[PDB]
């Protein structure tokens, strides 16, 4: 099945994210990574599931605020990832 690791990245983030809320909760996804982007260099990838950013869920993050935590200088992650096969 998948995996949960933490990303820790330190400065754009070279990442874009999509967001659903099918299943009574809101859940954000990975829409596309740069490949020379911080983000990627740290091993986001496509298609991952970003279960939090800077430990808050996803469910409990409104639009302003990912804006927000996106331009700052730091930024953590908590995603679900299938492994590399």
């Given at each position: 099945?998948?995996?949960?690791?933490?990303?820790?990245?330190?400065?754009?983030?070279?990442?874009?994210?999509?967001?659903?809320?099918?299943?009574?909760?809101?859940?954000?996804?990975?829409?596309?990574?740069?490949?020379?982007?911080?983000?990627?260099?740290?091993?986001?990838?496509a298609?991952?599931?970003?279960?939090?950013?800077?430990n808050?869920?996803?469910?409990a993050?409104?639009?302003?605020?990912?804006k927000?935590?996106?331009?700052?200088?730091?930024?953590?992650?908590?995603?679900?990832?299938?492994?590399?096969?």
């Amino acid at each position: 099945g998948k995996v949960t690791h933490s990303i820790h990245i330190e400065k754009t983030y070279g990442f874009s994210l999509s967001s659903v809320e099918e299943d009574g909760i809101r859940r954000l996804y990975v829409n596309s990574v740069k490949e020379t982007g911080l983000a990627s260099k740290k091993g986001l990838k496509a298609g991952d599931e970003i279960l939090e950013i800077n430990n808050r869920a996803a469910d409990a993050l409104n639009s302003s605020m990912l804006k927000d935590f996106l331009s700052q200088p730091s930024l953590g992650l908590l995603v679900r990832t299938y492994p590399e096969l």
